Design a binder for these strands. Structure first.
Ligand code: NA
Length: 92
DNA sequence: AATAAGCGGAAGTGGG
DNA sequence: TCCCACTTCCGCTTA
């Protein structure tokens, strides 16, 4: 099954949910979710995974928090809804 | 207060 | 057995 970081990188590459997520500085791997439209993207993540419950942005961000300990995706301090893929993730 | 978001421990579920 | 990669639940904190 696809991993969350790959789902997000794939969305950013395809542009299929451009009103829910976008690059801020793609060379640095920084991206941001839409305050008003992030739930639609969270719903899609849960459906792609086949999870029992409806996925929410909060539960998705809880998963993203675990990536911050390992560095796969860092949450930018002093900003809202803004994250940064590691260099390794961006290399493919 | 209402709303939004951050924070994160702990326990539950998948698939090895 | 026991870790993976989240998911779900709960509650406190900050804005
Ligand atoms: Na536990």
């Amino acid at each position: 099954k696809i991993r969350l970081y790959q789902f997000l990188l794939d969305l950013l590459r395809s542009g299929d949910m451009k009103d829910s997520i976008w690059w801020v500085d793609k060379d640095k791997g920084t991206f941001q979710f839409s305050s008003k439209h992030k739930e639609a993207l969270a719903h899609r993540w849960g459906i792609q995974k086949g999870n029992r419950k409806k996925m929410t942005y909060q539960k998705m961000a809880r998963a993203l928090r675990n990536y911050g300990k390992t560095g796969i995706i860092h949450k930018t301090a002093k900003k809202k809804l803004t994250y940064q893929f590691s260099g390794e993730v961006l290399g493919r």
